Amino acid sequence: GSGGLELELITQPKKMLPELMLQVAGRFHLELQNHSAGRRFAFHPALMAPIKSQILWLLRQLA
Amino acid sequence: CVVTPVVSHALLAQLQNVVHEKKLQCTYIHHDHPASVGSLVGALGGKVAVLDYPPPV
Amino acid sequence: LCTHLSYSRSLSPGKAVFFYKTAESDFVPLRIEVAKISGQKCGYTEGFDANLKPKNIERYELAYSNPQTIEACYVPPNVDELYCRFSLRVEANSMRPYVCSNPDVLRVMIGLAQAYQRLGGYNELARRYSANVLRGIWLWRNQYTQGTKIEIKTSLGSTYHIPDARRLSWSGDWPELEQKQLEQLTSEMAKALSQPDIFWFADVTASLKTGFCQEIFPSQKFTERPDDHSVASRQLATVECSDGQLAACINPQKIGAALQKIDDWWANDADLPLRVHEYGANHEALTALRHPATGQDFYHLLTKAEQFVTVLESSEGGGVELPGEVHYLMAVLVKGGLFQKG
Amino acid sequence: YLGRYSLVTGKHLPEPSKSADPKSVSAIRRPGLLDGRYCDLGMDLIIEVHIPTGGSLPFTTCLDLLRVALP
DNA sequence: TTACCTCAGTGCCGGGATGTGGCT
DNA sequence: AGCCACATCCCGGCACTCGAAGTCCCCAACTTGGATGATTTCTTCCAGTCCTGGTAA
Known about the structure:
By secondary structure, chain A is mostly helical. Chain A is 56% helix and 0% strand. The PDB classes it as dna binding protein/dna/rna.
């Protein structure tokens, strides 16, 4: 015991977290896009489901 | 074991000189009827200097 | 008895703070201000010497002002309610001597406290302490309001509420649904005072309905006369709030002295009750009601324990038989202090 | 650990516990005055507690007893 | 009683089974 | 070399994807020259009182 989504959406109830999966995955690709090495990987079709699945798992674990 | 503290004459008398010469942080404690407490307290007019070092809070 | 005997204090309070609410924030402190005033030249030695011998001054010399510096405190315009609160803890700490230099004295003081407990009597002390909380006498000179409400919460889940404290007397009988709360509160306290291993803690708040810019009277500091004439002669007590601002307060021992004003056992004539004191000190009249010359003080009575225990043990109990001397002594042990050279 | 530290000015007045004269006087005097310094604190403590016995008592009962024992 | 004296991913989940390492 | 305990391991099973348009790219952002003088800043009187020693003649 402000206002930015990466701060407010986590402050919310843990049960809600699984529904943020697509947003997290989005940010993830963007973070790669902004990196010197990640320009070869970001938004590549091959990594789509892998990244999304592992994130979804993590969120469920957090929930 | 029961312990009873007592003040050292030599140690207190030296401190009265050092804080004024070395410019240390200090304040003063008053005594009513100085003649009834001792040589040093009387000579100092009932005002005795002590160190003052509070925490940085 | 013996060279050393003493008890610590069993009932201890906190520091009381004044504050008020706004539509914008829940806690705003009441604060003090400082100002220069023009006083009067009046009183003896100002004009007379010796025993009524006028001294030689000219007529115009008393028409001059006497300036002074004081602190003062007023409620600001348009505040409808003022609030005051404090915390209280009570421990069952009169069952054992803090120190005692003699095992034969010790076993006797223990015997007495227990002999008393089982016949009743803690209820009597609890009733008196409880009455003083709910009456509101701990506000001292700030009792003159247009309406006073008192609310108490405790660690056991109870809550008490006095809808209007302005009429509860020391002697008399309280209105229904007030008399009853006094009984319930008495029970919690009577236990807290005598049974160990119970944690008890209370939180007492009150509200004062006031005048447009009414003057408020917080505790005063004890000071030296300044020699500067730029420093206040009358300085008031404040407390630091969690936000760093200062607020007007009442000192712990000033709240305490009020709560223990329960002694109307002297001279078989109740009058008004005294603050418990070994010699029966009376501050208003500057005297003492249990002067050693009368045989009525604590120190004479401390030697009759063997006789008292004998009576308590022989008595049936549950009645009205407990004498003034036994109740007095228990009240003094509750306000523990140094009882040595006995 | 120290969270709050406030210095309080002035000095305490002693209770009138001394009779002016031992007998035939109804006047009370003040024992004397001292010059000290006082403050208000806010603080936390972290105590390293050890239990000698192999089997310990990590229970609600002990948490109540830890609240009661507090001076 | 008194006088004195100080600066196509991914994630669980059951259940019967293949295979292995230490003792005799 | 033969016998026993305990590790995991892979198939059958189960559950999820998940509604549901896209919102413009790129390059430039000012140079020079000056900031005022002359004059004056208050006077009358006042600055409380009492309580809170130990030790030996």
